[PDB]
C-alpha cells in the first residue's frame, strides 16, 4: 500500500514501489447474441402518422440488418481476434448457430459446446425477435393496421435503439469496436459474465472491483448474422496474475553541468516504464500506454510485454551490477526538461535555462541548479521550466531522496558516444574500450614516428 | 493579416510569417454540478406499458448513477488533470460538497471558496433533483401510480438523455473526456461561462471568437457523485498571450543533384514547426498537432512548447548567424517528396523520379528539375510526384521566392555525416574538422610512410 518512491541522484531515476499488479494473460470469448426477426414484407395500408412512424422504425431496423449483413461480408473482421474470429467461422458451419439457438431458448445464459472442441458461454442480451413477432407483427398482419397507442411506438424505438447504436458502432469501426461500450454489453451484464466465467475467485473479485479497466481492455468482434441470430464475440480479458508486486521507473536526462555549449553529454536510462513480477520472471512494459494505473493496482497487458530474468530488479538499485546489463541512451541535446513522477518531479536544467518550484500560497520557493534534481510532492505544488509549466501530483506516500554521485561524471565527454537509441553498460564500456584502443593505436603510431 | 510566405532556396525552407497567435499558458476549472435524486425504492404496482416505460427510464437512471459511482471509485481519474484532481480531492472532504450545494440553491452560477484556498465558479447545468422529486416522485409515491401524460415520459427521457450520454462518455473514456462534448457543456453555457472568468477583455473576446478551439483544448474530469450532487471539473484553457507574432517553418530535404546512386547527401532542417513570441522569448512547437490554425490566427499549447532566445529568429533568415545554432538532420535517402506550405509547395526530386505541376484547366504546366524547388499557389493547383498526388492550398497572400545557393554544395559528401537526427551547424562544423583532423593525422601517416 505504501508507495515508497525512491529517487537516485546517481542516474537521477525515480523508481516507485509498493504497486500491486494484475497482469492480463488470457482472453475469454463470450458469444453475445441478439435474436433478430426475419421480416421483409409490409402488409400495412394505413396512412396514420403513428403507422408512418412504425414503418420508418421498421425501415431503420431493416437497414441496420442490411448493414450488419455487409459487415458479415466483411468478416472475418494478434490474439485479440485470432481467438475471436475462430468462433466466427465455427458459427458459420452448418448447425452451429442452431445449437446455440436451441440451447438459449430456455435460459438467457448458457454454456454451449461447439464443433471446435471449445465450450463458450452465450448470453442473450436482447430478444428483438420475440418483441417484433408478438407485438408489431400482429399489427402488420391485420389489414386495419391500428397501433394500440403511441407508447408502443416509443417502446419499439427504445428497444431498437440498442441495435441501431450497435450497428452504428460496427459500421464506423468495420466490426471491431474497442473499448466495449455500454451498448455492446451493459455493466450489469458484464458483471454477470464475470461471475459465470470459470476462474479463480480472486479473478472474479479483481474484475468486479475494476470494471472500467475491463471495458478499456475488452473487445467486441462482429461474428455472424444468420438464421434470425446476430452473434458478436465479446472477448473479455483474463487476469492470470493478481496482486503481484509491480514498480515503475521514470528516467530523466543526466547531462554535464558545464555552461559551455557542446561539452554536455546526456545519459538517460532507456529501461523506463513498468515492471511486474510473474512466475519468477519480470514482465517489462516498454511503453506506459498498456499499463493503466488505478489508485494502487497497475492493471497491465502482457500482449506487448517482454519477459526478463529476475535479477533485472537488482539493476534498479545497482546499475553497475554484473547480474543484469541495464539499458541507457547516450545523446547530446541538453534541453532542460521535467518528468512528473507519482510522488514528485525530476527536473533537469542545463545552459541558461531557468527552473523554479512554486507553491500555491508561498509562491515561488525554490530555484533549480544545473543537473537533474528531484522535488517531493508535499510543500511544492508547481514546477516551471523556461516558459512551460507542470505540476507535481499530490499523491500521498513516503518519498526518499538518495544522495548519488552523477554516473555521467565517470564518462569522459571526448570518448562518450552520441545519439545512441538504446545502449547497455556492457555495450557502452566495450565501445569505450574500442575507442581507447584506437587512441592507444594512435599513440603507437606517434611512437613509431620515432623508435625506427 | 497579410501572410508573407517566404521560400529560401539556400535551405529550400518555407517560412510563413504574419500570424496572430494566441498561446495558452494555464487553466480555469469550473465545477459543473448536476443535482441528482437519491431514489432507490419503487412503490409502484402498475402493469401499464407507460408505467413500464417510466420504470425502465428510472432503471436506466439508477444504472447511470451506479456507473458514475464506479467511476468515482476510479477517481482520482502534466497540468492536464492536476487542477481537476485537486478539486476532486477537495470535494471529497467533509462539508466541501455541502457548501457548493448550499451556495447554488438560489442561482445557477456562483463563485465559491473551498478549503484549499481557491475560489471557483460552480455552474449548475442540469437540475435533475427538482424534476425527479416534483414530477415523477409524487406519481411513484401514490398507490394509483397513474402517469397523467405521455409527454411527461418523453420529457423525462429528454432530461435524462444528457445524463445518460455523459455517463456513456465517462464510462468509455474512464472518467476523462476530451474534447468536451456538447453534453458536458453546451456552447451557450460555455460562452456564458467565459464572460464570468476573471480575465482581461481581450481573453474573453478571443475565446468568444474561436469557441471550437476552446473545446478542442478543453477537458472534463469526473470528480464526485455524492450527497445528491454529480460534480465534474471542466477545466477550460486560458490564453495569457493574444495576437503575438507567430510564424511557421516548413522544411524539405535538400540532396545532391548527382544522378549516380550513393553520392546524394540529404540535409533537412529539423527546427520545423511553429514559433511564437512570448515575454521576449520564442516559444517553439516542434510538432504541428498542438498548434491549430484558423484564419491566420494560430492557437498553441505551451505544455509541449520549448522556450528559446529571441535570436533564433535570425536563424530563419541566416542559418550561419553566430547568434543561434539551428537544428538540421543529415540523411542518405534521396526519395523525391513534396511538402505543402501555406502559399505554395516545396518539391524535391532526385534520381529518375519525375515531378509535374498542373492546373486543372491547362493540364500539366511545369516539370521539376533535380533538387528542391518551390511553386506558388496561384496558377498551379496540383503537384504529382512519381505516382502520388499533392495539392497546393488556395490561401491568398504574397509569396516571395528568394534565390539561394544550396547549402549542401559547401558540404563535401565524403566528410558529410549520415543518419543524424538533431544536429546543428555549430555541431556539424568540427566533426568534419575532426574528420579533416582524422585526415590530417592520416596525412601524417603517409608522411610517416614518406618521412618516417
Amino acid at each position: 500500500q505504501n508507495i515508497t518512491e525512491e529517487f537516485y541522484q546517481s542516474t537521477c531515476s525515480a523508481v516507485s514501489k509498493g504497486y500491486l499488479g494484475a497482469l492480463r494473460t488470457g482472453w475469454y470469448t463470450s458469444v453475445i447474441t441478439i435474436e433478430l426477426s426475419n421480416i421483409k414484407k409490409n402488409k400495412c395500408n394505413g396512412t396514420d402518422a403513428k403507422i408512418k412512424l412504425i414503418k420508418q422504425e421498421l425501415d431503420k431496423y431493416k437497414n441496420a440488418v442490411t448493414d450488419l449483413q455487409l459487415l458479415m461480408q466483411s468478416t472475418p473482421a494478434g490474439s485479440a481476434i485470432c481467438s475471436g474470429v475462430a468462433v466466427c467461422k465455427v458459427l458459420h458451419l452448418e448447425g452451429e448457430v442452431n445449437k446455440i439457438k436451441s440451447a438459449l431458448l430456455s435460459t438467457n445464459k448458457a454454456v454451449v459446446s461447439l464443433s471446435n472442441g471449445v465450450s463458450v458461454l452465450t448470453f442473450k442480451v436482447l430478444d428483438l425477435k420475440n418483441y417484433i413477432d408478438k407485438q408489431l407483427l400482429p399489427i402488420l398482419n391485420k389489414q386495419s393496421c391500428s397501433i394500440p397507442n403511441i407508447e408502443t411506438v416509443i417502446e419499439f424505438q427504445q428497444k431498437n435503439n440498442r441495435l441501431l447504436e450497435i450497428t452504428r458502432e460496427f459500421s464506423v469501426n468495420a466490426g471491431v469496436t474497442t473499448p466495449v461500450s455500454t451498448y455492446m454489453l451493459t455493466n450489469s451484464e458484464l458483471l454477470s459474465l464475470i461471475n459465470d466465467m470459470p476462474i479463480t475467485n480472486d479473478q472474479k473479485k479483481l474484475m468486479s472491483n475494476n470494471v472500467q479497466i475491463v471495458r478499456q481492455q475488452s473487445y467486441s468482434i462482429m461474428c455472424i448474422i444468420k438464421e434470425e441470430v446476430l452473434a458478436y464475440v465479446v472477448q473479455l480479458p483474463l487476469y492470470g496474475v493478481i496482486d503481484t508486486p509491480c514498480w515503475k521507473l521514470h528516467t530523466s536526462p543526466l547531462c554535464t553541468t558545464n555552461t559551455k555549449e557542446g561539452s554536455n553529454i546526456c545519459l538517460t536510462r532507456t529501461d523506463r516504464g513498468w515492471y511486474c513480477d510473474n512466475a519468477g520472471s519480470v514482465s517489462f512494459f516498454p511503453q506506459a500506454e498498456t499499463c493503466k494505473v488505478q489508485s494502487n493496482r497497475v492493471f497491465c497487458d502482457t500482449m506487448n510485454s517482454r519477459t526478463l530474468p529476475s535479477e533485472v530488479n537488482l539493476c534498479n538499485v545497482d546499475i553497475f551490477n554484473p547480474k543484469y546489463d541495464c539499458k541507457i541512451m547516450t545523446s547530446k541535446t541538453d534541453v532542460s526538461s521535467s518528468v512528473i513522477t507519482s510522488l514528485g518531479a525530476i527536473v533537469s536544467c542545463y545552459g541558461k535555462t531557468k527552473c523554479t518550484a512554486s507553491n500555491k500560497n508561498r509562491g515561488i520557493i525554490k530555484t533549480f541548479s544545473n543537473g537533474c534534481d528531484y522535488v517531493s510532492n508535499k510543500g511544492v505544488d508547481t514546477v516551471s521550466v523556461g516558459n512551460t509549466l507542470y505540476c507535481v501530483n499530490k499523491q500521498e506516500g513516503q518519498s526518499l531522496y538518495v544522495k548519488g554521485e552523477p554516473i555521467i561524471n565517470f564518462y569522459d565527454p571526448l570518448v562518450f558516444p552520441s545519439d545512441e537509441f538504446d545502449a547497455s553498460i556492457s555495450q557502452v564500456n566495450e565501445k569505450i574500450n574500442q575507442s581507447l584502443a584506437f587512441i592507444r593505436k594512435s599513440d603507437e603510431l606517434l611512437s613509431a614516428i620515432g623508435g625506427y | 493579416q497579410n501572410i508573407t510566405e517566404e521560400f529560401y532556396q539556400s535551405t529550400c525552407s518555407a517560412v510563413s510569417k504574419g500570424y496572430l497567435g494566441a498561446l495558452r499558458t494555464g487553466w480555469y476549472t469550473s465545477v459543473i454540478t448536476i443535482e441528482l435524486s437519491n431514489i432507490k425504492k419503487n412503490k409502484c404496482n402498475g402493469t401499464d406499458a407507460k408505467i413500464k416505460l417510466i420504470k425502465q427510464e428510472l432503471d436506466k437512471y439508477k444504472n447511470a448513477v451506479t456507473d458514475l459511482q464506479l467511476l468515482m471509485q476510479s477517481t482520482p481519474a502534466g497540468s492536464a488533470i492536476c487542477s481537476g484532481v485537486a478539486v476532486c480531492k477537495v470535494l471529497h472532504l467533509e462539508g466541501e460538497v455541502n457548501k457548493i450545494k448550499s451556495a447554488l440553491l438560489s442561482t445557477n452560477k456562483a463563485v465559491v471558496s473551498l478549503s484549499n484556498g481557491v475560489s471557483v465558479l460552480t455552474f449548475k447545468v442540469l437540475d435533475l433533483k427538482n424534476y425527479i422529486d416534483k414530477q415523477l416522485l409524487p406519481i411513484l409515491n401514490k398507490q394509483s401510480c397513474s402517469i397523467p401524460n405521455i409527454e411527461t415520459v418523453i420529457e423525462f427521457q429528454q432530461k435524462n438523455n444528457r445524463l445518460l450520454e455523459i455517463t456513456r462518455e465517462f464510462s468509455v473514456n474512464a472518467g476523462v473526456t476530451t474534447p468536451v462534448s456538447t453534453y458536458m457543456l453546451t456552447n451557450s453555457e460555455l460562452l456564458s461561462l467565459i464572460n464570468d472568468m476573471p480575465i482581461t477583455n481581450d481573453q474573453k473576446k478571443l475565446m468568444s471568437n474561436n469557441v471550437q478551439i476552446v473545446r478542442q483544448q478543453s477537458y472534463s474530469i469526473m470528480c464526485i457523485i455524492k450527497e445528491e450532487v454529480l460534480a465534474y471539473v471542466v477545466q477550460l484553457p486560458l490564453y495569457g498571450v493574444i495576437d503575438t507574432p507567430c510564424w511557421k517553418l516548413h522544411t524539405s530535404p535538400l540532396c545532391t543533384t548527382n544522378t549516380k546512386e550513393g553520392s546524394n547527401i540529404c540535409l533537412t532542417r529539423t527546427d520545423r514547426g511553429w514559433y511564437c513570441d512570448n515575454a521576449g522569448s520564442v516559444s517553439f512547437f516542434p510538432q504541428a498537432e498542438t498548434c491549430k490554425v484558423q484564419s491566420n490566427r494560430v492557437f498553441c499549447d505551451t505544455m509541449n512548447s520549448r522556450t528559446l532566445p529571441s535570436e533564433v529568429n535570425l536563424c530563419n533568415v541566416d542559418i550561419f548567424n553566430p547568434k543561434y545554432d539551428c537544428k538540421i538532420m543529415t540523411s542518405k535517402t534521396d526519395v523525391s517528396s513534396s511538402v505543402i506550405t501555406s502559399l505554395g509547395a516545396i518539391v524535391s526530386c532526385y534520381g529518375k523520379t519525375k515531378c509535374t505541376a498542373s492546373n486543372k484547366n491547362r493540364g500539366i504546366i511545369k516539370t521539376f528539375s533535380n533538387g528542391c524547388d518551390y511553386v506558388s499557389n496561384k496558377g498551379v493547383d496540383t503537384v504529382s510526384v512519381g505516382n502520388t498526388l499533392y495539392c497546393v492550398n488556395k490561401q491568398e497572400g504574397q509569396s516571395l521566392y528568394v534565390k539561394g545557393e544550396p547549402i549542401i554544395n559547401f558540404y563535401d559528401p565524403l566528410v558529410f555525416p549520415s543518419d543524424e537526427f538533431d544536429a546543428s551547424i555549430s555541431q556539424v562544423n568540427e566533426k568534419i574538422n575532426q574528420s579533416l583532423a582524422f585526415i590530417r593525422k592520416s596525412d601524417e601517416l603517409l608522411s610517416a610512410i614518406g618521412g618516417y
Partner: antibody
Amino acid sequence: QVQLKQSGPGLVAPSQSLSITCTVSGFSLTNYDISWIRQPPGKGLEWLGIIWTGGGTYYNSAFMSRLSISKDNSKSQVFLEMNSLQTDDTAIYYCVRAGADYYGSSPLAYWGQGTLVTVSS
Amino acid sequence: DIVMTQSPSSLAVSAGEKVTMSCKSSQSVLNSSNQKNYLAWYQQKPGQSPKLLIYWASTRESGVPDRFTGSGSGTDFTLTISSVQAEDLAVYYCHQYLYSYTFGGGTRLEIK
C-alpha cells in the same frame, strides 16, 4: 480489536423475506470483504455469497435467484436478505470476513456472534 | 464446485494421544498465480462460532495453540494434533476457497 454485531430477526414464516444486518467495527468496510456463511443444525458450514470491497457481489449459484447482499461504507454496514425462505433453510448465519486479493490473509477469521434463523409459521 | 472429503466422520481418543484427520479435494487447489494452496482448517467448539486454525495447510492463525499443525500437498492434506486436550472437544472442518467456497462433513473428536 475488530468486531461484528448482527441485528435483525431470525424467525420468519415460510415463503417470506428474511433480512439481517452486520455492523462492523475496528476496520474499514472499503478494505475488507464480508462473506456470509450458513450452518444448518447438525451439519457443516456452507457458502451463501459474498460482497467485495467495490460493492459487487457473487451469490451462490443455488441462491442466486433469492439471495441479496448489499453494503454501505459510511456507516460500515452489510445487509443480507433472502426471499422465498422455506423450511429447509433453518440454520445459523455468520457475517464472516475475508482478506485481500493476495493469499496472505486470514480467510474466515472473525465470524459473527451467530444469528439463529428458524423458518416456521 | 470442488467437493471436500474429510475422514473420519468421528474420531474418539483419550487425552495425550495423537489424532490425524485427512481431507481430500476433488480438483487441485494449488494456485498458479501466487504458488499457494487455498485450504483452511477450522475448529468449532459446541455452541461457539468456528475459529480459524490453519490456512495454506501450514500457516496457523494468530493466537491458536501450536499443537495443531497439519501439512499436505496437491489434493491431499492432513491435520494432526500433537497433544490432545480435554477442552479441544470440537468439530473440525476443511475448507477450500479457490474456485468457490465449500466445506467438508466435520471430523468429531470425543475424549475418553
